RNA sequence: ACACAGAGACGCCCAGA
RNA sequence: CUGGGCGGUCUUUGUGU
């Protein structure tokens, strides 16, 4: 409104206040855009602005008609003028006029507004336009304003007595403001009206007029000229396209545009629709007749009664019909041997021979224990002296013996797989062969489950405190917190040490041991006959090992004596063991690589269980308390879950969280959990999933019996009855959305048998057989009862409509010529390198379609950037310039080639296609299409990432102010059923036909339609086993389907006669088409938005109910938000019943989209929504907090030492924003210190005990030392910051001083202690087959703007390739799966071996003596000017250091838990902030005149000698750079002045509403343990 | 023991017996 | 049926935040 007052409510303290940007979003229902007739002529343009219509709103009101005229001068600004048109007319004062004069360049520019405040304080007002839809662009156009006027004004400054001012700047965007002052909603709001006016003016008069716009860079104008070359010249042959693939008629399209949807149909299709809804909502429900809520939930409660005992009698049909089973869930003993020295004691009283006389297993012992004690040692137990003397200055030592077993021994070991193949025909390996494959009976007994679950002893203390490996794990963890020695520090420190001597941990600790050993041992052979005998390090168990290879089982017995068994876990979930006189032994077991990253990980995960339920059950870490039942419940089921591991019980406990959330549905609906028993049949193969499926059942009876309780508490809802779905407790709501994800602590990366490869093709065949035999209602015609992959061409259109009315609303008319100009932008800037990736590509082609000649030859998957060297190699600049070949290839071929293979997931079972070259480039530009039209929809989030947040907080704004308070929000959470399998493609190209000009048509068209005819490859190995069993006795008729269609038995459409592929037409694939089916759901949603607000309209009476209607999407997953403000009591019921058929109605309304509604969906909850499994309980958002932590060892293969704490850290702070409290990060990061001393050998090199205590002298995190992250602050700050806290209080900064000295005379040095995985042998083989010249370095020191520049020439594209080829992205890279087992099995050599490089390999204990010999000339401490070279944000860094040393005791007090649980932004490092741009442009510009930045002559070079004060050797010629500087490569001066540009960093925190060093110490004082206040 | 409403794995490659 | 060879081995990881 006033120029004055918005200036009036800003206050002004002390000198020069700034404060922070405040991003505003369209929040408000819009008015429709006045008419404007645009008019030019060489005196100016000419606008004849309409009548605004009228709503209720008053937006728009300074919108007035009239006639205004602007030159043809500004011409280029009106979106600056007339957006600020009416908040700037105060004509113009220069910084000179009201500012001291220092006479420099600066005097002459003038900002928009300098307002005086009539009485003595200047505040200045800087406004800024920027047409990006994108939030970045925002804060770009922020940045670039606030940095040209901060400097001047700030030299400014202190020239004055009293320079009590304020600068602020406004971004105006098409939706969304960013301002630092407090302006109103309504003027934003106002603000964006005026842009969107004023863009379409400036569209309007740019489309008619050439020179309007300033002239373009001419990059991209060459990059828009020849996207408009490709798209005007490129011919698909369509004529081929529909003789190729089917449904491929153009003619299909031309009707789909051209002709109008039918309303008549529209309206008697909804009205039928609202009929079967409202019916089966009425049938479903109970509605009729009339009766109270009791009887209603009395018999919902009998019919979920009666599906569970049929669910369960068809269960029991099929099973083995066993009441009574002896399997131990855990197939380990429950020893808990006291921890001892290194030593072997076999010392039997009795003698060997006595073990001779107790079976297979004891004879097998009693030779074994033999053969050790008349051998030699050297095997058991790993040498010292041998590895002393190899360190000090690869082969694999395992002590193997041959016992002589008699033939029934040998039949007993093969019974449990131990040479089992040479068995396989025996009368006893058959019947155990065939026994093996039969499930398990629901009524199977399984009692015992949960009394362990309720009475365990996993929870107490195992006195086991001042043995080795816990005094190893001490001493580590005080050299960590010496640099950080607080009171608090020592309270959690003792916390972890408290909780580290429980039983379980110390049994998990020497499961991790011989999980370890297995895994070092998986890389060994044994001949037939042969075993190997092991010690593990700091027990007395003895294993016996078989190995067969690493892709196969390896098999393991364990024996211990009876005397060293000093206590035990209790429970009878444990497999039996054998008794021998003083001996126990184990049977054999087997294990995989997958099978062995739980058992690795158990202990920390076990810490990690036992801190999080303990801070979730409201205990403090500093507290000792006797352990509960809900305690031990969560933390046994969590051990049952690691070592079960299996994908059933990991489905059963995952499908308990949409089982509970039908206990947040509302009258007059029901909880309807029996939903969820079409999900939970299948076979059960053990006793945990018995007990798991009786449970699940049983909380799905209770939750039909019962909804939970929704209690107004004050303003704020609560709710209560909330319970654990597998224990049946009851606890609180945070507890119970936790517990849906324990099933996550299964192994995500499990490995796929031949076995479950079919299964997976099931997931495809099923959806191929329901095509349509008539392509009639594939995009033709029009039904009100669609089929399977059938749709509606009218709903489909009006849809389309309702996205396009939409989208004008939003962003304006002429809206499609801005996407043309931001699509060709998008096409034709981007070249074929950029495709480069390190991800596979597909190999299959017409050579592999006939199994006949491919049975000998070996498939695999080679990679997309090796593809695109090869077209590089051919001179192929451009990715457009490659389309055309790509898709001429694709047409020759006449199918698309696709490849198979299985996700590894948390969720179930989903198939994955990988694509090959032509078909990937052919893709490429229609998903970059889709995905700038679902940039403009206003409520799409996977193009729109903020949009997952802002439409669920602003839906109470809206109901606030068009309703008033007191308004009920009902929601549903959809979920689709079968997404990309469903959508048959025509519909997806008519959807993206339909938002672009016709010139794109014939491309979309075409690139849409090879997906109607796709070759997927299936397994080779899978095809082997297939072809010699020509007959099939499977009860899966799946298995008969595609066994006689292979052999030629059965004629399907799908697979052919001897063939390697199957033959898929409907559906697409998994994300390929993500963009234009998110493009889709957002029409579908649109649709459902303005159908809901005229139904709301019309009523149920004849009177409007006053309501508002949000709806949010992504790719398939979506939610509707609608608020509804009663006016009486049966109004309310009134209003409500009518909301609930409108919600209930969609399920019925997805059918004619060809979307189909999944039984996950929750629908009719109040004050309760969920969008991507965030949880919003009213004003209460909640975050499975358990889902990261059961994540914080999940690392990756890192070549350099110190990346293992980087990727430790990025977990911590994964684990932080996911709602864990400062002292639950901090135990996370103890047993993360603990996983990484046991990655590096603890528990498998005898020389680790040298190696901690002489790394106590040296803690240097390239040689392995853990840094640890402050308690009050754990997670907040990255690994940089703890380096450099410990450079400047440890003598780690004295020896990279001294380093850097060295370096000087004749981060950075973290990473110089490296270890090569495979000595990057397949790399190196990577680099022999492009031809790609080793010259490379040295021609781009001939020419630096090379690194600088898009592309000139081939020879330049293959110097950037050479670049990329030779970087950390694809080094770390080639990395297989199960990280874990492959790193730690590298842990028995790494200490004591050749194997570390250093920046002539050595070993980490010859590295660590060699920098103690160095450490003698250490001197000084570490430079300001390395100390702003290699920590640029130091400084910042500092003002962080210090502002946690006023917390630094455990006081504080236990408040009143205030819930108004949100989510926050906390800047803790921002921006470096002495440069204005950043000096990659900085130096690029000034080089090579490339026009990066926005400065103009006189500002680029202040910002160039701003430059040159820091670094010193910096030159203005590139040669002098290269021979004046300490980087002898352009490569790293690249890297150096990228990373110099130092970032900011911002955590994303959980907890009380902030009101913006006040934001962190408040979040360190708040966010220390959930209801408690330190300090 | 692993996988599985029985599709696999329980070693694979050679040289001579 | 005797002496041997076998790891970044292959399986294995796609499209978007
Ligand atoms: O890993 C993934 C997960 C999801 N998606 C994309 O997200 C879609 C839905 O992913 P989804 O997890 O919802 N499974 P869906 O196919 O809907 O069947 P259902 O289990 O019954 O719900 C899929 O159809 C893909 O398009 C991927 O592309 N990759
Ligand atoms: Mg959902
Ligand atoms: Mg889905």
Known sequence: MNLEVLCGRINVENGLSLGEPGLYDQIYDRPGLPDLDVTVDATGVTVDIGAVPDSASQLGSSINAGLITIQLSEAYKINHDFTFSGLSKTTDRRLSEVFPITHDGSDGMTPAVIHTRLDGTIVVVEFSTTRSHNIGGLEAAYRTKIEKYRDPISRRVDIMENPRVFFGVIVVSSGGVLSNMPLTQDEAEELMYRFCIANEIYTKARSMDADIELQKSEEELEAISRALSFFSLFEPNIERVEGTFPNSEIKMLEQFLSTPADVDFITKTLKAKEVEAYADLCDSHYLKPEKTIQERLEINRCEAIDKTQDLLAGLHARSNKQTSLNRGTVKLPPWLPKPSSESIDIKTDSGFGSLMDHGAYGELWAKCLLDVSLGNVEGVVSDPAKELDIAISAKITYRRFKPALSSSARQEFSLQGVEGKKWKRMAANQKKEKESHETLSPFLDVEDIGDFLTFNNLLTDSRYGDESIQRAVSILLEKASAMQDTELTHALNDSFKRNLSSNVVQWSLWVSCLAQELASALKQHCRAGEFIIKKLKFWPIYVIIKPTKSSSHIFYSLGIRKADVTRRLTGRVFSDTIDAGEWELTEFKSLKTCKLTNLVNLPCTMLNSIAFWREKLGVAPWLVRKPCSELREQVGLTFLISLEDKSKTEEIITLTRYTQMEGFVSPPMLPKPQKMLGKLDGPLRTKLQVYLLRKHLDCMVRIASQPFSLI???????????????????????????????????????????NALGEMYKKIVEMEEDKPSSPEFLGWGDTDSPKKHEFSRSFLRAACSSLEREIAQRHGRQWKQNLEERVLREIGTKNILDLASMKATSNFSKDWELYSEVQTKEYHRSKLLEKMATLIEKGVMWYIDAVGQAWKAVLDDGCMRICLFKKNQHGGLREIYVMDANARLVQFGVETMARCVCELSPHETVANPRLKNSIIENHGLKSARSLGPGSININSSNDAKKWNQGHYTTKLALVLCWFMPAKFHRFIWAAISMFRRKKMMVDLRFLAHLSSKSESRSSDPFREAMTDAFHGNRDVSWMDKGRTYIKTETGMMQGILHFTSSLLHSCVQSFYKSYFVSKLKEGYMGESISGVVDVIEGSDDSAIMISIRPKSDMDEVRSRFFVANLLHSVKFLNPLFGIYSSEKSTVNTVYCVEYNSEFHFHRHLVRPTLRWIAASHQISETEALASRQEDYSNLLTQCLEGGASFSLTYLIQCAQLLHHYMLLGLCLHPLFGTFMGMLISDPDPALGFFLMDNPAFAGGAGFRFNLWRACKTTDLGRKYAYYFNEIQGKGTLSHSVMVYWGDRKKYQALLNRMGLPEDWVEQIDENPGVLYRRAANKKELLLKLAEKVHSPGV??????????????????????????????????IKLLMM????????????????????????????????????????????????????????????????????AEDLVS????????????????????????????????????????GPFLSHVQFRNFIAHVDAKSRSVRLLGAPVKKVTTISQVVRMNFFPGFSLE
């Open 712 to 754: 107004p508490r004050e303003g704020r809802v609560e709710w209560g009855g909330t319970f654990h779905a597998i224990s049946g407790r009851s606890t609180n709501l945070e507890n119970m959305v936790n517990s849906w994800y324990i099933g996550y602590y299964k192994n995500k990366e499990e490995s796929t048998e031949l």
């Open 1371 to 1404: 080094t770390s890279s080639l990395s297989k799966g199960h990280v874990v087992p492959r790193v730690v099995a590298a842990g028995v050599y790494l200490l004591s071996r050749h194997c570390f490089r250093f920046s002539q390999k050595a070993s980490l």
């Open 1411 to 1478: 920098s103690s010999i160095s450490a003698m000339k250490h001197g000084g401490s570490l430079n300001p000017n390395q100390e702003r070279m290699l920590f640029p944000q130091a400084q910042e860094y500092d003002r962080v250091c210090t502002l946690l040393e006023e917390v630094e005791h455990l006081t504080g007090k236990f408040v009143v838990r205030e819930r108004n649980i949100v989510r926050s932004r906390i800047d803790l490092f921002q921006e470096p902030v002495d440069l204005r741009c950043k």
């Open 1485 to 1524: 510009e000034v080089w090579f005149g490339l026009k990066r930045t926005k400065l103009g002559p006189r500002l680029l070079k202040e910002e160039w000698d701003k430059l040159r004060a820091s670094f010193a050797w910096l030159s203005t010629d590139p040669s002098e750079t290269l021979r004046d």
